[PDB]
Amino acid sequence: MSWELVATVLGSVSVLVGAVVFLGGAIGLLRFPDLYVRSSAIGAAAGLGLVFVIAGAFLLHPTWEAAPKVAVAAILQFASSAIGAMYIARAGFLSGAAPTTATRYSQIEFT
Amino acid sequence: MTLESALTLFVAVPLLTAGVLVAVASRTRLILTVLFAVLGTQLAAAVATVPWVSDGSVVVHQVALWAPGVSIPFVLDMFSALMLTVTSLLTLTCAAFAVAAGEAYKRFYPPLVLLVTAGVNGALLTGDLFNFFVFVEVMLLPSYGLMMITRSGRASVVGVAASRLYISVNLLASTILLIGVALIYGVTGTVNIAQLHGAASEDTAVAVATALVLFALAIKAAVVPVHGWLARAYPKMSPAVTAMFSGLHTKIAIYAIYRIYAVIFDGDSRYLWVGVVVFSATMLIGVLGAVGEAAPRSILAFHMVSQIGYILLGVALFGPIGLTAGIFYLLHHMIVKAALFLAIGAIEVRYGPRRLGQLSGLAKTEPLVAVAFFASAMSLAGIPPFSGFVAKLSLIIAALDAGQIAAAAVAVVVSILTLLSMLKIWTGIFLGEPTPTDSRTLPEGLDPAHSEATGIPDGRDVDGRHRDGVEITGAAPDMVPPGRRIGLALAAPALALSVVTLALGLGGQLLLELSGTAAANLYDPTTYIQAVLG
Amino acid sequence: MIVVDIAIVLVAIAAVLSSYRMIRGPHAGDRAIAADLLFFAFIALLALVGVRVDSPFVYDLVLVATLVGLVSALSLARLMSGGRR
Amino acid sequence: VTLTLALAVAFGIAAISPLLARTMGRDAGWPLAAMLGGLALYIWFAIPVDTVASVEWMPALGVELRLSLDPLARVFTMIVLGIGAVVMAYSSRYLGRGSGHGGYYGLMTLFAASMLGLVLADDVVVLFVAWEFTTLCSFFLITLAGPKGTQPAVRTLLVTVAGGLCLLTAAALMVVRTGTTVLSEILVDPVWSADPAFAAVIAVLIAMAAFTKSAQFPFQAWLPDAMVAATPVSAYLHAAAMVKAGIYLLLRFSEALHDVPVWNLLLITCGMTTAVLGAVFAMQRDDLKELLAYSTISQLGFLVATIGVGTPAAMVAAIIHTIAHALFKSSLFMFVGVVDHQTGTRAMSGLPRLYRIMPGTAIGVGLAAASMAGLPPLLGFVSKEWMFKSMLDAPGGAWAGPALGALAVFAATFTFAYSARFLLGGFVETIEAPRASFFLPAALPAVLGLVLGLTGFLLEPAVAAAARASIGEGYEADFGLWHGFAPELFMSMIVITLGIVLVVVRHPVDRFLDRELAPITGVATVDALRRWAIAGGARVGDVTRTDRISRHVWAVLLVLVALAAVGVVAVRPEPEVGSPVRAEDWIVVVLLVVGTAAMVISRSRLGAVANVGIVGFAMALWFFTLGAVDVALTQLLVEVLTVVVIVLVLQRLPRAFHTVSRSRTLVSAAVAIVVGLASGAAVWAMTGRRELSDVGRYFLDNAEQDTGGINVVNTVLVDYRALDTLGELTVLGVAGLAVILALHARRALPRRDVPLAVHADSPLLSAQDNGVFLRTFARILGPLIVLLSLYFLVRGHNAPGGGFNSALIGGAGIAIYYLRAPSDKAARIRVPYVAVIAAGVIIGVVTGLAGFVDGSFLLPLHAYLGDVHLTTALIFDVGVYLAVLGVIMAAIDKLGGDDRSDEP
Amino acid sequence: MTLAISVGVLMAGFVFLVLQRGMVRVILGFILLSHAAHLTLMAAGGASRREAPLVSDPDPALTSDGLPQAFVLTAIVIAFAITIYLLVLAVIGGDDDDTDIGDLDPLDLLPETPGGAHPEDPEPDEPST
Amino acid sequence: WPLRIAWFLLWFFWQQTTTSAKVVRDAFLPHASITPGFVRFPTRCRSELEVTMLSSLITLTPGTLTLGAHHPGEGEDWEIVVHGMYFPDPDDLTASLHDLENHMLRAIRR
Numbered sequence A: 001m002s003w004e005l006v007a008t009v010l011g012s013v014s015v016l017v018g019a020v021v022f023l024g025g026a027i028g029l030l031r032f033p034d035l036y037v038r039s040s041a042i043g044a045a046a047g048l049g050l051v052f053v054i055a056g057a058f059l060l061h062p063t064w065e066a067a068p069k070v071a072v073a074a075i076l077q078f079a080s081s082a083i084g085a086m087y088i089a090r091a092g093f094l095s096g097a098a099p100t101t102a103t104r105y106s107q108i109e110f111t
Numbered sequence B: 001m002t003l004e005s006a007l008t009l010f011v012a013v014p015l016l017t018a019g020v021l022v023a024v025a026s027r028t029r030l031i032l033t034v035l036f037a038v039l040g041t042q043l044a045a046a047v048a049t050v051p052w053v054s055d056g057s058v059v060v061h062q063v064a065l066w067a068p069g070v071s072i073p074f075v076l077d078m079f080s081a082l083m084l085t086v087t088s089l090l091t092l093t094c095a096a097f098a099v100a101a102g103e104a105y106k107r108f109y110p111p112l113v114l115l116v117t118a119g120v121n122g123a124l125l126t127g128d129l130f131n132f133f134v135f136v137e138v139m140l141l142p143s144y145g146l147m148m149i150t151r152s153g154r155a156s157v158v159g160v161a162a163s164r165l166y167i168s169v170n171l172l173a174s175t176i177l178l179i180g181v182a183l184i185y186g187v188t189g190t191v192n193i194a195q196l197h198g199a200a201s202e203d204t205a206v207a208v209a210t211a212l213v214l215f216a217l218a219i220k221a222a223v224v225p226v227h228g229w230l231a232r233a234y235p236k237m238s239p240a241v242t243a244m245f246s247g248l249h250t251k252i253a254i255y256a257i258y259r260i261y262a263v264i265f266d267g268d269s270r271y272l273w274v275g276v277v278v279f280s281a282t283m284l285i286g287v288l289g290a291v292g293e294a295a296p297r298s299i300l301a302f303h304m305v306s307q308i309g310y311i312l313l314g315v316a317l318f319g320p321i322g323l324t325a326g327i328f329y330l331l332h333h334m335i336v337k338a339a340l341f342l343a344i345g346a347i348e349v350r351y352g353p354r355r356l357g358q359l360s361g362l363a364k365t366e367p368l369v370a371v372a373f374f375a376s377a378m379s380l381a382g383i384p385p386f387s388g389f390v391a392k393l394s395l396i397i398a399a400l401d402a403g404q405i406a407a408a409a410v411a412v413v414v415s416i417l418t419l420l421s422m423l424k425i426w427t428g429i430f431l432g433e434p435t436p437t438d439s440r441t442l443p444e445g446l447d448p449a450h451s452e453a454t455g456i457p458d459g460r461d462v463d464g465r466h467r468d469g470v471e472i473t474g475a476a477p478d479m480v481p482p483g484r485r486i487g488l489a490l491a492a493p494a495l496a497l498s499v500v501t502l503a504l505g506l507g508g509q510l511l512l513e514l515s516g517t518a519a520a521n522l523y524d525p526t527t528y529i530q531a532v533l534g
Numbered sequence C: 001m002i003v004v005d006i007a008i009v010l011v012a013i014a015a016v017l018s019s020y021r022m023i024r025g026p027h028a029g030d031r032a033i034a035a036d037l038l039f040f041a042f043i044a045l046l047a048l049v050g051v052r053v054d055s056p057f058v059y060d061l062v063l064v065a066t067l068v069g070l071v072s073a074l075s076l077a078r079l080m081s082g083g084r085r
Numbered sequence D: 001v002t003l004t005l006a007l008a009v010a011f012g013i014a015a016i017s018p019l020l021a022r023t024m025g026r027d028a029g030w031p032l033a034a035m036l037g038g039l040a041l042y043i044w045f046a047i048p049v050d051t052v053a054s055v056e057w058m059p060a061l062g063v064e065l066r067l068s069l070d071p072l073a074r075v076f077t078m079i080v081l082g083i084g085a086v087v088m089a090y091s092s093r094y095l096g097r098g099s100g101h102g103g104y105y106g107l108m109t110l111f112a113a114s115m116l117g118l119v120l121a122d123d124v125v126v127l128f129v130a131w132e133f134t135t136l137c138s139f140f141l142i143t144l145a146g147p148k149g150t151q152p153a154v155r156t157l158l159v160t161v162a163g164g165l166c167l168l169t170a171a172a173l174m175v176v177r178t179g180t181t182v183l184s185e186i187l188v189d190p191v192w193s194a195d196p197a198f199a200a201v202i203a204v205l206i207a208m209a210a211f212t213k214s215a216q217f218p219f220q221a222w223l224p225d226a227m228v229a230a231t232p233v234s235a236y237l238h239a240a241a242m243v244k245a246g247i248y249l250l251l252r253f254s255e256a257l258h259d260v261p262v263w264n265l266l267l268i269t270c271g272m273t274t275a276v277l278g279a280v281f282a283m284q285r286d287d288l289k290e291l292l293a294y295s296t297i298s299q300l301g302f303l304v305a306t307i308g309v310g311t312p313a314a315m316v317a318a319i320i321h322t323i324a325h326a327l328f329k330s331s332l333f334m335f336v337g338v339v340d341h342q343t344g345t346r347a348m349s350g351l352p353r354l355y356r357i358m359p360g361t362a363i364g365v366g367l368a369a370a371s372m373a374g375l376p377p378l379l380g381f382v383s384k385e386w387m388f389k390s391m392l393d394a395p396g397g398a399w400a401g402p403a404l405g406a407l408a409v410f411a412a413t414f415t416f417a418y419s420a421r422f423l424l425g426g427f428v429e430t431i432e433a434p435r436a437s438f439f440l441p442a443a444l445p446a447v448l449g450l451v452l453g454l455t456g457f458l459l460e461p462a463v464a465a466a467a468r469a470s471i472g473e474g475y476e477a478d479f480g481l482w483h484g485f486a487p488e489l490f491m492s493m494i495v496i497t498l499g500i501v502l503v504v505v506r507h508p509v510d511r512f513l514d515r516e517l518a519p520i521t522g523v524a525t526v527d528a529l530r531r532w533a534i535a536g537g538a539r540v541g542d543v544t545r546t547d548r549i550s551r552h553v554w555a556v557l558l559v560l561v562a563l564a565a566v567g568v569v570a571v572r573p574e575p576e577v578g579s580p581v582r583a584e585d586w587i588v589v590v591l592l593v594v595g596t597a598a599m600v601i602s603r604s605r606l607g608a609v610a611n612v613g614i615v616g617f618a619m620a621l622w623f624f625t626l627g628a629v630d631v632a633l634t635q636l637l638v639e640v641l642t643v644v645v646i647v648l649v650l651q652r653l654p655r656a657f658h659t660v661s662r663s664r665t666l667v668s669a670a671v672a673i674v675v676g677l678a679s680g681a682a683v684w685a686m687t688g689r690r691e692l693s694d695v696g697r698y699f700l701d702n703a704e705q706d707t708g709g710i711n712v713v714n715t716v717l718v719d720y721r722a723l724d725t726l727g728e729l730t731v732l733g734v735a736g737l738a739v740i741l742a743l744h745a746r747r748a749l750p751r752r753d754v755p756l757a758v759h760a761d762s763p764l765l766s767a768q769d770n771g772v773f774l775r776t777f778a779r780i781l782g783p784l785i786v787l788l789s790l791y792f793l794v795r796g797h798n799a800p801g802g803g804f805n806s807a808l809i810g811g812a813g814i815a816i817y818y819l820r821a822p823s824d825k826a827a828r829i830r831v832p833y834v835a836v837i838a839a840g841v842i843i844g845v846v847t848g849l850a851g852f853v854d855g856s857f858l859l860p861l862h863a864y865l866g867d868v869h870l871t872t873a874l875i876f877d878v879g880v881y882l883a884v885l886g887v888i889m890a891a892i893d894k895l896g897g898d899d900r901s902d903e904p
Numbered sequence E: 001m002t003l004a005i006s007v008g009v010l011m012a013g014f015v016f017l018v019l020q021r022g023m024v025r026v027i028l029g030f031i032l033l034s035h036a037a038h039l040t041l042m043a044a045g046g047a048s049r050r051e052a053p054l055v056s057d058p059d060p061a062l063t064s065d066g067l068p069q070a071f072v073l074t075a076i077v078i079a080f081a082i083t084i085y086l087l088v089l090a091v092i093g094g095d096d097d098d099t100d101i102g103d104l105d106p107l108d109l110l111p112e113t114p115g116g117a118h119p120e121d122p123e124p125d126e127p128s129t
Numbered sequence F: 001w002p003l004r005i006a007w008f009l010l011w012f013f014w015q016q017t018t019t020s021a022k023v024v025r026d027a028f029l030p031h032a033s034i035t036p037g038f039v040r041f042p043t044r045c046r047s048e049l050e051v052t053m054l055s056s057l058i059t060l061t062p063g064t065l066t067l068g069a070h071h072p073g074e075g076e077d078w079e080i081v082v083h084g085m086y087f088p089d090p091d092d093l094t095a096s097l098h099d100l101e102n103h104m105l106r107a108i109r110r
Ligand SMILES: CCCCCCCCCCCCO[C@@H]1O[C@H](CO)[C@@H](O[C@H]2O[C@H](CO)[C@@H](O)[C@H](O)[C@H]2O)[C@H](O)[C@H]1O
Pocket: B273, B276, B277, B280, B281, B284, B406, B407, B410
């Protein structure tokens, strides 16, 4: 009803969703054969889960001086979780990360 | 300004001029003028601040003028003043030696010496514990840069392994000191040394933290259980850098042990037996390692360990006489060891680092450095015509007075081994017929011909007719017959500090009175605590 | 704030699992992707803890840790490539 | 003060002797002989028999330069300065016709000055000073004659200091016991009669101090080899320069320590053993340089034995024999020198007995060796019969008295034997007789011996007055060769008889007792001790021989474990205040434990740096949980800037850590567990036991009122304890300069050549075309990082992060700029960073030094401009910002890549 | 007691790493030791008050003490400088960062011509005779 | 229009929690149900910004990842290397990537 209880429950469900996403991206780091599957899962998990946790935390005590420092932080988290995983996968390919035996097609030679 | 606000100028003038000598670092003449001007004005300020506290007074300046106990007190109590003047004299003479040797023209040598001097002045004048740690790091960081400055502008694998060992066992000692300060602040309320006037004889919880602090300072001072790091790091350094360090770092640790055990522990006299035991074991093991060695500058490191055991024995004999003996021994020994690393260092500059026996007859071809070495050697062994005799005699008197017969017996027997090792040096370097030796003054690894490095930029290189501080002939090996290689500019800094140790032997009452007035600030710190806290 | 404690325990369990992957990582690149996921989980823990111990000065850190969990991740890539770009 | 004036003149003689030696080549021995002897004629005449002059030297130690001229000194100064003068008169003609002889005279006259200071010593400390003065001058005199005597000089210095420093211990003991440093007040102290356990120790110490200055039983192996020096310095050192120093010390201290049994025994038995074993070895030796040394040894042994007798009748004999010996041994040495310099060799193939060229220098040796043996019409005979009369009443009962005489009779038999061998026998034109000004200074002591043996009535006043001043009582002395048949003479007709019988049977005797002797003598016992000392020192130094960190840290951790074992039973903790453990605390503890374990079990350098970053993040979360926001910020930034540097230095090193053998990880882990438990207990039992520090309550109470800022941490860092911040910014700048110096002194390892297993024509290569992701994200991360570094720099006084977080968040931007570059050439930071460090340190120290305007050093000078509290803390923050930024620039530009592009 | 468990674990990690082989494996131990020192410094300020001292009027007995926070804030920078210098030391000596070296003094003296400057007069004190 | 941004961010968070549920489902797929494959994809982006944001959007998608970018042409045509899970036929992967590229270029452009 009130304009603060909605924010409270929204932040609560948001931090729960973000924690669940972090747990899913961590379980991905266990039951995934490749480095590239791992990075493809992490690039999404570490970004979405962390943005969710940040926004939910902000909703659980919505100060007015921290809104820009969260609006910038969310975009930076997304871009960084994308680019870090991209470069980790690329450097793993260069360093010689063997792709899993269950790779149906690869248009990039490994040597 | 109140003439006590100017007490901080011992740390502000170097830190400024150093920061200046980093900006204009290519003008070697200007920076070598400014460095010696600052070192001379610092020596003058210290020798003029000695008459200020000769009446047992204690000058305390609350930095930034906050409440007593809130800010960092800068104290000056005829112990800090004596340490200031003697260490500044040592720094001045070692810089005057480095200018002639070949250092002080490399990049950032004048700034680093001034930063080390600022750190030493801070660690001496400070009155609280954590800022003492900060100033110890301010003293140690430029020391690590000076360990790479060499006469040839290069560095070897040995000279970098010694630096690794030095920084490793010093970062560990610094962090142990930090943990001790943290535990003192945890059990007590403050890190100020004054507000800990007696917080070591009231509860053992603070006594264990203060023992941790004293153990870190003992690591920094190279007492007998932790001493190999100093015997294996000082030999592998430039002859001027080791001479400059011989009187600063370990001696700042000695001053810290004195101040801490005199103020915090209040000279509790219950834990003096451990001091006696450890420091007598130091006096013994250091001189044993010395007589066992075979290198000239590696003997003096173990001798420095043994003399550190000698000095710290003055605090294990706490009282009016033991503290006086220990302070006089500190002020004499840092001067002598400076004059000893400058005489042996002046040989390693012209004749290269060799073992004992590879040279001979240097007492005939180079009488200046031979005199400067033998005077300091007899003073180190405690021979009457010099200062060390007064120090050892007062120390033996204080040891027999306190009833410590074993410590006195060790401190009087170790002089025989000290004399044996100094005579081994004198016989293997100076006595003999002058034989022709090869012109090779740089071991393979430090010379600018077998190293892929670019070398530290020399200051006297813009002339064009200089490779790395060597007079290349220009453009438009065979054994050298015995001669005089060490000019006056190289044997003069080792000789100046070799007549100080004789002026202090003949006229020693002047320094004995100041040592007594400095001890009166340790066995009775009421006038110091009453000055820092009001 | 029971939801925040639940989220903290879940993020801690995720961090522990990803650090297990860090330890038993076959290829050196797995020990870097686990480091990335753990840096992001540590930012999440910073936020959730700042919620628990109610603090206004949290997101400064959150604004900085993202500029830190990235530079300390790209560099790891720069180390897997042997320094070569 | 006239006695101190006499001593000062004796030292000024040594000060002026090099000038005379350079002016007069060798004739400089003529003025000194008439200047060092005339001084004697002054000290004897124009100074009363007992004057005490004392000038202040060191009132702190209670030491004063206090000279006394008691009759014992009145005899010993004479016997020193007269022999010194006659030796100068002899050396003026002995030395070659050279120009540079200052090194010889400046020492041989400083020897006389040091001896004068020793015998004229009423303070025990100045006595020790003159003792070591003589020992140093003697060391330097033996170091002459080239390298022939560099080892004998070292052994002489070592042996005479090992004893000359026992005298230091005796002096310090007598000073701390009797409370005063005066020889005239210590010997008459009632301590020598109260407790004999102290007088015994002092007697042993002083006997050892005088057995080394002389050459007695254990320490006799430095006189026979110190003969390598010139024969005039041997004459002085043997007549009275150093071997009489120990005897004067035994005579002076005999006033107190004469009734203590250990003194009597240690003196008598040692002196008699060395007398017998010096006379015998002089009988066996061949070179007259060794024979004279082993004869001086035996004479000093006789003297110390008759001193250890310790009765008034014994000190008279000791003094008269000291005089007789200082005469005849000096003349014997000078005559050996003259007979060597007038022929050319003392022994090259032997030499016909000196009575071949009889006129001039043969009757001199006949008058010297005769008194050395004790022939009746000489001074040696009356002195020897006085010694025998003294020894007959030695202590130890009624049996060990006459046994001492029957031992002295053996020693005197052997001494007559070797003196007769001296006068005649092989010691394996020349009509140019010794010059009248060369043989005369060598015949003055030999003739003085005769004229003092015959006219013996001239010595009883001085000798008896010098004996009642060496010990308490006095003895009516007479030296007259009276023919009253007493056992003092029956053991002198036996000496001559058995000695004649011995010298007429010399060959079978010497071929008999030589094979069955075994090496009691010989210098290979002091060299053995020096070798043992050197070996033990090498075995002690071999403990810390290896200069590797893993060992010298073990010495630190062992003492840490010892201190922990002490503190475990030492510390009793106070009750806790509140509870320092929260719910959201075990999660960060678990994350930190997991990160630390993954770091310590990581076998690859990349896993280790990843775990370092993780531990840094966990420590930042720790600092933020404890309520430290600024510290958490700085920890995050320092973690990222150390991960960057570890990557920059790991791209040059191999991929896996070095494999360390088992049974070395086990011991390391076993000591790590112990030190970890110790540190954990320390932090658990010492932290949460007090309410709040008074300085902490002050900072939280008077932060906004004193400085206008609410960020207590930043105000403490920049306003209250600004010296710590100045120190740490100088530390960082210095670390930057030191990185520059290190990478200028040694070439850093090149980036390790990783074999990229991908072919050229494939994507995921061509960094210029493949770094497009970072080269674009940096277009929005550059301005963001710059405005963030400027955001923290101004808000630092009322919000987390003042200047260090501001600077490290710009260092992160510099790391981004490095990672962004296409290749190694563009990655080099193209700004002057050494000048930036200089400017940062300058700005910091200046804005701290501007406080003197109102206050003192490092005090803010806040000035209000409308509604902004503008303060110089902002300028100090700009300074530290520049410093840290320059340090990061240097660390990234020097370590990043290789790019050797700066030199012709 | 958590601030004690973490300090103990960090100190154990330091003592282990600093005793291993390799200079980087020692710099990591020194990093852990600096972390332990910073943590025990933060523990000395009570650690029972978890509120930041950044409010307008800080409430004593409820906010964390500021002096140990400044202490760790300075020690962090100091240890960071020393760690930077140790890391740049790790990549200059030798061709690796290996630390197991023995007596290294022979490599800093001159070639030491045998016998000495006087091979005819060996010192009787040296046990090598 | 003061509450436009709130509606926008809430719609964004719904379109992101659907992606998050997709991620969580992707973490629990059985083995042999992931069929990773690499694909060279011509990007049809001119400037650097378009191609890097396309690659980031491909990575943030829970089923793909962009390894790197390069263009073997004169100065244009950007190519990317995309790795895809549960895409058993490369044509399916390229069709999904073409859909994403169209949906993005129709947004960030004139
Ligand atoms: C290489 C060694 C060189 C020679 C070393 C000479 C050391 C001589 C030390 C004499 C000190 C006399 O001072 C005395 O020291 C002893 C131990 O020694 C202390 O005695 C203490 O020692 C241990 C604890 O460690 C306990 O067994 C004892 O009960 C306790 O009192 C006395 O409290 C102190 O009065």
